[PDB]
Amino acid sequence: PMPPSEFLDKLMGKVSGYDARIRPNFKGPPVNVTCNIFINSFGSIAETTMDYRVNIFLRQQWNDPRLAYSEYPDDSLDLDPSMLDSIWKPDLFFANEKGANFHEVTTDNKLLRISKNGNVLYSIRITLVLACPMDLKNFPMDVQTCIMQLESFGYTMNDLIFEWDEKGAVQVADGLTLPQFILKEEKDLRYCTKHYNTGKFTCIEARFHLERQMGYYLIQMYIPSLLIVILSWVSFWINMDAAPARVGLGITTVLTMTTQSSGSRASLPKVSYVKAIDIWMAVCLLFVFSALLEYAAVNFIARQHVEEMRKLFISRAKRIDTVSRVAFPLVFLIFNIFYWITYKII
Amino acid sequence: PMPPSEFLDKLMGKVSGYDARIRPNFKGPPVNVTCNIFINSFGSIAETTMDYRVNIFLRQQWNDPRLAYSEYPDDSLDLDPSMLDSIWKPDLFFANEKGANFHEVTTDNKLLRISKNGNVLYSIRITLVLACPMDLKNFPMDVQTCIMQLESFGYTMNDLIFEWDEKGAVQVADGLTLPQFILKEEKDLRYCTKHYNTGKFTCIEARFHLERQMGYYLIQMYIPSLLIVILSWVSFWINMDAAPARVGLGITTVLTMTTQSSGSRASLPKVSYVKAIDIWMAVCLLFVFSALLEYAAVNFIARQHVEEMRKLFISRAKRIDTVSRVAFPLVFLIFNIFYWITYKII
Amino acid sequence: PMPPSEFLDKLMGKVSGYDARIRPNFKGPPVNVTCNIFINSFGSIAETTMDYRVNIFLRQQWNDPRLAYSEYPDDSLDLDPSMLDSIWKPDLFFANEKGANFHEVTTDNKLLRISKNGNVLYSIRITLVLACPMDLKNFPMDVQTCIMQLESFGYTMNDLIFEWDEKGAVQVADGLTLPQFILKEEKDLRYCTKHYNTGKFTCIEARFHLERQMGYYLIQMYIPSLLIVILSWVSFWINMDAAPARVGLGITTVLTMTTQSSGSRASLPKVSYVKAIDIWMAVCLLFVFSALLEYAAVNFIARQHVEEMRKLFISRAKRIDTVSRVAFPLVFLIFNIFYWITYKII
Amino acid sequence: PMPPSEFLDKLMGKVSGYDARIRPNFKGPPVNVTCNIFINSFGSIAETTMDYRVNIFLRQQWNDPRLAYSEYPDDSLDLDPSMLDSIWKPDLFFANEKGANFHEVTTDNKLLRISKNGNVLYSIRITLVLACPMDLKNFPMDVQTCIMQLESFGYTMNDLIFEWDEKGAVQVADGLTLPQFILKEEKDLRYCTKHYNTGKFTCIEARFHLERQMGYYLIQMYIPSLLIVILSWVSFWINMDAAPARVGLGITTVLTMTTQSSGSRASLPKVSYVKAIDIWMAVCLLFVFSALLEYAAVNFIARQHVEEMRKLFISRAKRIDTVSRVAFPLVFLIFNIFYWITYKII
Amino acid sequence: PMPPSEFLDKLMGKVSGYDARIRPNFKGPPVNVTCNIFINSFGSIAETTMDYRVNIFLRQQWNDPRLAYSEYPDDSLDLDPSMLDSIWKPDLFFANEKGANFHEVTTDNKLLRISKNGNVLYSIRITLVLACPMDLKNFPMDVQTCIMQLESFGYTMNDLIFEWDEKGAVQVADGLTLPQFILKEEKDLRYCTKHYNTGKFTCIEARFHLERQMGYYLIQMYIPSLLIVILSWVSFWINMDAAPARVGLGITTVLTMTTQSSGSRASLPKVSYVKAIDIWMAVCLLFVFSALLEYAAVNFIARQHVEEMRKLFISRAKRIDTVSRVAFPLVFLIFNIFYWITYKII
Ligand SMILES: *[C@@H]1O[C@H](CO)[C@@H](O[C@@H]2O[C@H](CO)[C@@H](O[C@@H]3O[C@H](CO)[C@@H](O)[C@H](O)[C@@H]3O)[C@H](O)[C@H]2NC(C)=O)[C@H](O)[C@H]1NC(C)=O
Ligand SMILES: *[C@@H]1O[C@H](CO)[C@@H](O[C@@H]2O[C@H](CO)[C@@H](O[C@@H]3O[C@H](CO)[C@@H](O)[C@H](O)[C@@H]3O)[C@H](O)[C@H]2NC(C)=O)[C@H](O)[C@H]1NC(C)=O
Numbered sequence A, B, C, D, E: 001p002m003p004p005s006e007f008l009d010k011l012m013g014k015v016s017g018y019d020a021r022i023r024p025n026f027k028g029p030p031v032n033v034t035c036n037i038f039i040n041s042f043g044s045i046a047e048t049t050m051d052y053r054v055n056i057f058l059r060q061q062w063n064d065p066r067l068a069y070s071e072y073p074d075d076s077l078d079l080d081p082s083m084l085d086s087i088w089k090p091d092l093f094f095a096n097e098k099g100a101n102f103h104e105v106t107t108d109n110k111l112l113r114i115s116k117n118g119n120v121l122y123s124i125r126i127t128l129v130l131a132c133p134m135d136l137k138n139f140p141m142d143v144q145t146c147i148m149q150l151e152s153f154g155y156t157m158n159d160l161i162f163e164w165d166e167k168g169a170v171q172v173a174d175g176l177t178l179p180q181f182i183l184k185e186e187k188d189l190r191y192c193t194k195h196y197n198t199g200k201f202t203c204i205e206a207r208f209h210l211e212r213q214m215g216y217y218l219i220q221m222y223i224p225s226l227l228i229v230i231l232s233w234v235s236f237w238i239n240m241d242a243a244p245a246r247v248g249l250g251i252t253t254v255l256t257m258t259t260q261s262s263g264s265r266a267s268l269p270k271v272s273y274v275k276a277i278d279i280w281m282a283v284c285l286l287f288v289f290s291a292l293l294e295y296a297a298v299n300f301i302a303r304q305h306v307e308e309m310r311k312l313f314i315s316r317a318k319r320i321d322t323v324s325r326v327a328f329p330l331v332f333l334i335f336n337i338f339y340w341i342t343y344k345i346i
């Protein structure tokens, strides 16, 4: 008969002594808030800043016995966000926020419904820009584990405990793709219970494993740098004598493999250690410079070394030729059989 | 006689029991909100972020029988946005917001008018930065379908239903142009009715088909890369012997076609797969390197190969010359007759 | 005797029935709001975004007969912006806002004064980021006409009409300069009266004509590209035979004129059509490549062509020499006499 | 006995008729507000935008006789910023704001104290982003005079007058350094009294003279470009004949001096006129191209010009050699003795 | 019995005369506020702007005897941030703010608890963007000392004194890493007590010593520039005569060592003085140009200098050869034994 918003104003008003500043079960057991999120959007995972933007639906559930109506005939009284500052709510925050905001377009994007036994569902929409430290040792083949962690701010462990619900604690939207990554399905769920000189505060966290799309770096970086090493060798499939074809086509490989090494570290943070794209760009400069070093070894013989003198001339220039037709692919393919296996076992 | 704002304060005040926290037709059929937008501005369609900024007039229409006056002699009571928090409004939001805001310069840019039978028109001005996933397989010749979708947040399907009106559900402003795209006239209108563990919520969406302006990429990228392949061949329209004119003008084509390939992927997201500008830049490097590979094949003969010996010298250097005057345009024009037709049928 | 703020609180308070939610001359003729702006700052005219930032003083004047006091001895009651939400104000907005804001440093920068006959002056300070479509056909020699337009949002044409006052409808600050443009003095003033399915709404607009500073593009782009075409020709003022001075100094012009063509399209939007800086950079590559094409024509003769044979050798190499000393300036100066006149008549 | 905040609530409350909307000395002489600032931070002086960020303490002093208590035993009643909207304050603003904000971290950073005779000190903390037009004629050796100006917005000259106090009208923080500039100690203080069709409004302004740090541009730009002109000449300290050492080492100077000219105009606004770094980069390309022009003059003689014929050969190649060993430093050092003196007298 | 929020509303309400506008111990000794921070996040230490972003938990402790309850049986009454504007709080601010903000996601991230003896703990979460002047004399090997300083704004020294507590005045979060730096453990704690014409105000400050990660600059800059100096010398391990192998491989070192010098000063502020990466890039161009200067010295002999004439030819070309095989590593390794020791003692 009486409408619920009219019914609820006396359920939690100044009458019946409801004070929104006081947690449920006061001077009792701690409040068990159970949580689950729903990732709408995900991404812009910057590595210069080592953070990522996420857009979630944070659902929180607890039990307020002061709100447990009995006589109203329905099962779920909702509550618009205008009266949402009138009940108790948990003081959740994110321990690695780095700035975040609500969404208020056409209405505060907030949801609240109250069951008969005082079970309270509270769902809001948040955009977060969460920090995650990026480990870039094996850079195009890394698995980034960027986390997010949810803590109480004012209430300690003996007053308020966060939990993940067992019914799908992290859902992901259906067509959620990433431009550079794959969000794996297994999401680790564990506690991070903090300690300060103020006290100990509850924490729960989720761990998202992000595996890269290697195919972009394979297209822009590896495959052109693979062919210049092949360009380094067909220029050695060359005429009898030393020639300017052995000169300009050797420094051709120098200009390209440094250009590929210049544009390699374009959008990378200035990490102190060495990453996997470096030791590819190192060898793809080392085998480039070993093409000019063979021509100088030929020029060390072509200027140094009339039937006996001409026999001593080609007694060295072909001992160096028929080996480097074989030795250059041997040391290169023994590198790839050692390079790729290390980055396909980690 | 009595002014409408004075008349309306008793129409929806504490007298006559109007509660703005309660939807129309409560414990009845769901509220049928019908919607249409008006795109003022559109654009800044970034592909690094995969989003786009739009500036709309969101019109919403529904029926509140509590507001249906009968005795006032007019037909449309308006209402300034100062008293706009005093009636019920739908809690619409955008499922791919990524940040949005109102416009409050000189007045809240909001409109509200109420007919005699309780029909309510509600128009606001919003700037949205909506996410859309970009498919870039055939990159300069793609048709991007970026959508926008309008959902309820608190009310489920049995309480509130969104509809597009049949009288022009998406209007576009008159001189609305795009810097890089063409907004097609046919705009798909369909439902995206969501399901959560909270419940099922209404959704309607519009699908904007965006076809690119190919002419910019044709000017900067294709036409210069077309002429270097022609530059690759007039350098083969060359003198009798091998010459440094066949040397420097061949690596000239190497420096330019990599420069055109360097500046090609300037503002592109790091997509894993391969796009259509790549397989043009691949062939426009492959036919470049097949110009130096012919000179090395000549230098493989010019150093290897006195009337019989000089007849064997030109017995190969012209068998390779008169074929590549014909074979280079044959394999190039058989590429364009296969390249362009695939990107003119999709 | 009684102070004006005390006098005004009863002039527009709950006594005397003044309702700020109701326009003047209600159920009468429409309100004639007359407007004029004062541009303090202007600029940051971006072409990537196709917008520009302006900082104005928006003055609005109308007549509220409810505010027409008679007995107070002064002529202009002012009103601080604290009580500014207490009278009726027009709901002006900008139809191409793209974000805007007020200025509230040390005080709301707002002004309000009321004459005896109810004439109301209302002046505020706004920063606007207004969109204007940029036509870039003749790019360094274009006249951009970027507009701004002022509309009502809630009131239709039969309730509220905007006008420009005839006494200087747009003033400009005294030392207002632009970094790249010249704001012309003639400013077009016309109507843009909108029509929607909601109704028809008033509009007035001003049109600012912006002519560029050509001298920057003449310094960085034209004058260096002019001298390389002269560098293309003094390298043809060369010795008798073919020489490497005719080789490296020809590709010198290739590297520079592409470098000038690379840095040409640095900060430009990706317009589909072709602009005037392109067809200068096209010809300044075409006459560059016609310098190497003459050396290859010489090398087509120097390898092809003993007193009769040496007479046939210079029977072609000087027929090509003494023409290109004349033909290269003839086709170049016939280009400038056609290029510049088209861009000095539009 | 009675605490001051309790004492002050009746000093300026509804009792004793204090109205915060009414200036002191109403219908009397104008209010003399005296001002002084304290620059905490200064800088980020961008020249693309032609503005600069400053962080000040704006102190304002005036006299309100309505606030002049007599009987309370102290000398300075302070007032927290919660009650700061309760007294009259001047409506100061900045005529070249371009966006500004207060600081509200942990408390509104605002200060207010009231002496016995109604003298009121009012100090706030503001961050400003002030526009200043940049004159860049002599660019690395310029003295920029960027100003800031403080005006009233609502009160005209006959009601409110701004003054600088004579006791240090602009203080600067102690260790305030600039990354690229030197703030000179002499700061000009003068009026800029505005006139509008509204009326005439008070203004005071301060003029900050900013002299650059020339040493950065001397390190990156001048000293490398100085040595290439020396590199241009040691390559002329060369062997007897024409050689490829006179070829590649000449175009070496072309590639570097254009690279230094490319990176010169990296962060500069697109000013129409010519600046001082240009006419250094012009001459440091002109003397570069006069090194290749001498080799072509030698090649004009080395191909043109057997005991009499060999005497005529070196009768020109050494007349050009021993002059350019002297003429190149003579015209270069006569340039620096004219270049630097003009930019060391202005 | 009575709940604390109900108990506290009469403890600090209008009854019992608590005025939040009045400091504790009024007309008494100054309030001793003791402080400690907790750095959650740290970084984005920009050097273009010379600032850094930090995310702290600011804890403040003082004693308000007006709040000292006696009869309530607990020891710590908390207080939600809704009623937080109802007690006295210190007006702390940061003397080098450059913009800062609170965090209000899901709740104002603020904490307040009150002991029995009026001890008040007050903890808030702030994001700061603090300015620090960067000294870059020895740039990759510098120790930056960026500070933060906490001052009162309204209360002078005789009313409010800040202190660091002796129990860990700066804590740092556990896994706090930096992308480019190492935050040292020793943090200097000292006073910075300000003086103005207003009065003298309290200050405390903390000094964070930041030592760089040298390994990134060693990977990108030093190690490639080390090998080009080795590339400069193996090209001198060359054949007998002068050769184009001594020509192109010498200017190869010119192009790379300027490319490494171009990309060196990529993200650096325009400091006037010279930094340590410059005098490495200077010498790594000087020993590059001393490779071409030896070839020109050989070409000064190879063109100048038949059994006696050929003995005088190699009487100089090997006196210059066998010295530069020894003199080039001697002057280079005597540089590193002087370069690195200066930057490993400071
Ligand atoms: C919130 O969740 C926590 C954890 O599930 C609940 O705390 C637990 O409450 C139960 C009963 O309320 C306690 O069990 C009792 O333990 C005593 C001592 O071991 C034993 O003698 C009894 O027979 C009974 O088993 C349990 O100890 C306690 N655990 C902790 C860590 O406190 C809490 O009750 C929940 N609160 C609400 C409002 O749901
Ligand atoms: C909002 O729009 C919906 C959909 O148009 C309306 O729901 C429909 O309402 C009609 C009559 O109110 C229902 O028709 C009736 O259906 C029963 C059972 O099929 C039949 O026996 C009756 O003879 C009559 O045809 C219809 O079923 C119902 N559809 C749904 C899906 O609920 C709703 O009434 C509208 N509400 C308002 C306030 O306009």
Ligand SMILES: *[C@@H]1O[C@H](CO)[C@@H](O[C@@H]2O[C@H](CO)[C@@H](O[C@@H]3O[C@H](CO)[C@@H](O)[C@H](O)[C@@H]3O)[C@H](O)[C@H]2NC(C)=O)[C@H](O)[C@H]1NC(C)=O
Pocket (backbone or CB within 6 Å): C025, C029, C030, C031, C032
């Ligand atoms: C605001 O400005 C508009 C336009 O100037 C005013 O509307 C005009 O008002 C005049 C008199 O109020 C009307 O003139 C009358 O027209 C009738 C029919 O033509 C004629 O029989 C009368 O002798 C007289 O000339 C005029 O028609 C009307 N124009 C329009 C387009 O409505 C309006 O009155 C102004 N309102 C205020 C409050 O100043």
Ligand SMILES: *[C@@H]1O[C@H](CO)[C@@H](O[C@@H]2O[C@H](CO)[C@@H](O[C@@H]3O[C@H](CO)[C@@H](O)[C@H](O)[C@@H]3O)[C@H](O)[C@H]2NC(C)=O)[C@H](O)[C@H]1NC(C)=O
Pocket (backbone or CB within 6 Å): D025, D029, D030, D031, D032
């Ligand atoms: C604020 O400062 C202004 C400027 O200092 C003050 O205005 C000046 O006030 C004095 C006395 O109040 C005026 O002096 C008188 O001038 C008349 C006519 O010249 C002369 O006959 C008298 O013997 C006396 O010298 C002076 O003219 C006036 N100047 C202006 C430009 O108005 C003003 O009084 C100050 N107000 C306050 C509240 O301090």
Ligand SMILES: *[C@@H]1O[C@H](CO)[C@@H](O[C@@H]2O[C@H](CO)[C@@H](O[C@@H]3O[C@H](CO)[C@@H](O)[C@H](O)[C@@H]3O)[C@H](O)[C@H]2NC(C)=O)[C@H](O)[C@H]1NC(C)=O
Pocket (backbone or CB within 6 Å): E025, E029, E030, E031, E032
């Ligand atoms: C806040 O901290 C300051 C500094 O610790 C306290 O000021 C100090 O207060 C003590 C006693 O209240 C003063 O000691 C007395 O000094 C006089 C003169 O030297 C001496 O004759 C007495 O026998 C006694 O030792 C001390 O001088 C004073 N120091 C200063 C610099 O003022 C202050 O009391 C603290 N306030 C609170 C509320 O805790």
